[PDB]
């Protein structure tokens, strides 16, 4: 009766207008306090991400084969009871699976039998008696796994994951402030490409991070590293182009980072950097640079070297005057300059053409120069500033900006 009633009131049409999209621009639908999965949900064939969240002990019927496009399932506190045909369809179709659980019994045993699975995300503490890194012993059956996120507050990386790491390309660990016992045990995952230690609270860089040669993106988010001193050994990482050292107590940048010339997306924001030095600009390949929420004394002139810079973000830092060398570069696109102590914005911003958005709200900005109207890509949504400061501009250039905005 519950299943048929749930089919009835949650009909397919309101569900059709219920459809939404994710950051991957994939069609989802969030099921939230449902008795089971309505058959109207399974009738849908354009579904990409099915969100079984808090669905009490739902039995998956074979009609999941109707979900031909189904590639993503996020079982959030939802134990999935499944049978052989639905198992076969999921083994032959399903490829990404983010299982969030609060108990070992909540984790289904069939998720280790899927062939085509490549993205697997776990949330929930995994340290237990007589089950530590044994329930995931079926990860060896899964040979297509490439993404393994473990928000499990684990104290050490499991060895079964190390054997998986021959084919694993991405390993993100979230420990919520728990030091993970490295012991250089990540040297087995030579195929690892994106080691994103989230909230690992490491306070140091182990040698395994720069021992593997295959990492392009290494984001040590909230790893609490006081001194960023292991960056000399990262030059052997020719693949490394994204070294996001945000959310740390880095108080000064040693000049040695000038060794790493391959860096593009250096996101060094939300830190206490007293100043980014001239030698930091020795990496001319830097295309995306984030320094937001920092303690910079000023912004040096060698920023003119970074000709590839697109978005420089120094929001809520301490920069009193904008150097003309900042405007010497022409490739700037997103200027996060708000909440600063910028006395005034120089007219040289009229040189910038790629600038499609610029954050100018707050600050000590006396007036906005008319040269901001010279920028073609900039519009009202791009130019976020206070209403009075925007009104300081002449009426006709404001009309031009309005007309370019609305259309």
């Amino acid at each position: 009766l519950r299943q048929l009633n749930l089919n009835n009131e949650w009909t397919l049409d309101k569900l059709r207008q219920r459809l939404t999209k994710n950051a991957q621009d994939k069609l989802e639908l969030h099921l939230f306090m449902l008795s089971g999965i309505p058959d109207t949900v399974f009738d849908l064939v354009e579904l990409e991400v099915l969100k079984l969240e808090l669905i009490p002990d739902v039995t998956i019927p074979p009609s999941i084969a109707q979900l031909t496009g189904l590639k993503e399932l996020w079982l959030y506190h939802t134990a999935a009871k499944i049978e052989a045909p639905a198992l076969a369809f999921l083994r032959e179709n399903l490829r990404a699976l983010h299982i969030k659980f609060t108990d070992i019994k909540e984790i289904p045993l069939w998720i280790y039998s899927l062939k085509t699975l490549e993205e697997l995300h776990l949330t929930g503490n995994l340290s237990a008696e007589n089950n530590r890194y044994i329930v995931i012993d079926g990860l060896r059956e899964l040979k297509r796994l490439k993404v393994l996120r473990l928000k499990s507050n684990l104290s050490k990386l499991p060895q079964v994951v190390t054997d998986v790491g021959v084919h694993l390309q991405k390993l993100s660990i979230n420990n919520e402030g728990t030091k993970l016992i490295v012991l250089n045990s990540l040297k087995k995952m030579v195929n690892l490409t994106e080691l994103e230690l989230i909230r690992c609270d490491l306070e140091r860089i182990p040698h395994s991070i720069f021992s593997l040669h295959n990492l392009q993106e290494i984001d040590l988010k909230d790893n609490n590293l006081k001194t960023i001193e292991e960056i000399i050994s990262f030059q052997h990482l020719h693949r490394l182009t994204c070294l996001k050292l945000w959310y740390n107590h880095i108080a000064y940048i040693p000049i040695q980072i000038g060794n790493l010339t391959n860096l593009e997306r250096l996101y060094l924001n939300r830190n206490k950097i007293e100043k980014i030095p001239t030698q930091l600009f020795y990496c001319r390949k830097l295309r995306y640079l984030d320094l937001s929420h920092n303690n910079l004394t000023f912004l040096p002139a060698d920023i003119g070297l970074l000709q590839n810079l697109q978005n420089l973000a120094v929001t809520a830092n301490r920069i009193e005057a904008l150097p003309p060398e900042l405007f010497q570069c022409r490739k700037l696109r997103a200027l996060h300059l708000g909440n600063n102590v910028l006395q005034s914005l120089p007219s040289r911003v009229g040189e910038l053409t790629n600038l499609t958005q610029i954050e100018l709200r707050g600050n000590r900005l006396e007036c906005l120069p008319v040269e901001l109207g010279e920028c073609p890509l900039l519009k009202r949504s791009g130019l976020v500033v206070e209403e009075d400061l925007f009104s300081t501009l002449p009426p006709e250039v404001k009309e031009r900006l309005w007309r370019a905005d609305k259309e």
Partner: protein, 404 residues
């Protein structure tokens, strides 16, 4: 049951839809006329600002400890309650507050147990017994407060401000027709830097402002300043660069302006000034001078002294004569002379290299000269004029001007 219904009504996806930005570049959740606060709101942890509008009979649980990213709180016409862990966390984390007290009890008494609070927006209204508000004089517990804006009919500045003068920096008061009195409470301001008094009905600038020795700026908005004779002590405000005395009634400007030369921003728009003296433009550090919608008869030539000027607004004046010395000042970036009684635009106007803005709208002109091409920073938008004045450029000058 109320909590269960609150969580049932508003799914987190609906809150994703509700997510927006605010006037301070924070992630805002606008919650309008709600029965309460759902726990689904606190399930969002990326949130930077909370907006609660007329959501009364609301008790803040410990669950707000989930979202660490809060910096702003908008508690608008809502009587809110509190819990111990909420007190501790909002003591540790919350810094920006914007409340509206339509009713005095709709102001909750717990804003003042915090310390990390920095910005405060006290919009609303107040009664005759102003000094009895002990809610105001508990900000001694606040240590980080730096922004205070009180849009209310406040006649007497409380001893609260007197106590919190050590760390307070910005004032914005809109009395809206209410006379402000008891200005010793503004005398004992010591470390304040900004003062924006709107419609306070202050007939004269008090010795309170001159007791301030570190005031960056002063606003005497909607204040009936008939005469300005107390400027002699304004020299004590060495930090004073902004004097936005606009929509005012200053009939003439005396010599006392020589007391302070650090003055930079000078707004006398819609003032009662008849003739400017020889003594304004001695203070060469002035860059930002406004006389918009005034009725000045004419401009004397001593304007030539103001070289470091970058803004000279006299729009909608009765000025029939612009001498060429303001055209001689090339550092003048903005120069608004709109709707005056002038006759002809200056032919030797291309000498002003750094002339970003020339608002000369509605002026009785005849023919534009060809030397606008020599002007590097003057546009049709910048030189706002009637269209029959726009149609006057030579054809080759049109070819050079459409390509700037």
């Amino acid at each position: 049951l109320k909590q269960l219904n609150l969580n049932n009504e508003w799914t987190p996806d609906k809150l994703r839809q509700k997510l927006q930005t605010n006037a301070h570049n924070r992630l805002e959740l606008p919650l309008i006329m709600l029965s309460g606060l759902p726990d689904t709101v606190f399930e969002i942890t990326e949130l930077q600002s909370l907006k609660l509008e007329i959501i009364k009979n609301v008790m803040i649980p410990a669950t707000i400890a989930q979202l660490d990213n809060l910096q702003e709180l908008c508690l608008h016409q809502c009587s809110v309650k509190i819990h111990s862990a909420a007190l501790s966390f909002l003591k540790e984390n919350l810094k920006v507050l914007s409340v509206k007290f339509d009713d005095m009890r709709e102001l909750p008494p717990w804003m003042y147990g915090l310390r990390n609070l920095e910005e405060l927006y006290l919009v609303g209204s107040l009664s005759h017994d102003i000094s009895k508000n002990v809610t105001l004089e508990s900000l001694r517990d606040l240590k980080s407060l730096k922004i205070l804006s009180i849009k209310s009919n406040v006649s007497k500045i409380p001893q609260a401000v007197v106590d919190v003068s050590s760390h307070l920096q910005k004032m914005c008061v809109h009395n809206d027709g209410t006379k402000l009195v008891m200005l010793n409470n503004l005398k004992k301001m010591t470390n304040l830097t900004e003062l924006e008094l709107v419609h306070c009905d202050l007939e004269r600038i008090p010795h309170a402002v001159f007791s301030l020795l570190s005031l960056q700026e002063l606003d005497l908005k909607e204040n009936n300043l008939k005469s300005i004779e107390e400027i002699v002590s304004f020299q004590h405000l060495r930090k004073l660069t902004v004097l936005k005395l606009w929509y005012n009634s200053i009939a003439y400007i005396p010599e006392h302006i020589k007391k302070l030369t650090s003055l930079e921003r000078l707004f006398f728009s819609h003032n009662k000034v008849e003739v400017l003296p020889s003594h304004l433009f001695l203070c060469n550090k002035i860059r930002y001078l406004d006389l918009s919608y005034n009725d000045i008869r004419f401009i004397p030539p001593e304007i030539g002294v103001l070289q470091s000027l970058q803004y000279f607004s006299i729009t909608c004046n009765k000025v029939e004569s612009l001498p060429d010395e303001l055209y001689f000042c090339k550092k003048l970036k903005t120069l608004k002379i709109g709707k005056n009684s002038l006759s002809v635009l200056s032919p030797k106007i291309g000498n002003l290299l750094f002339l970003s803005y020339l608002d000369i709208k509605g002026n009785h002109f005849e023919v534009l000269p060809p030397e606008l091409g020599d002007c590097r920073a003057l546009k049709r938008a910048g030189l706002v004029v009637e269209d029959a004045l726009f149609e006057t450029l030579p054809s080759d000058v049109r070819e050079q001007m459409k390509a700037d």
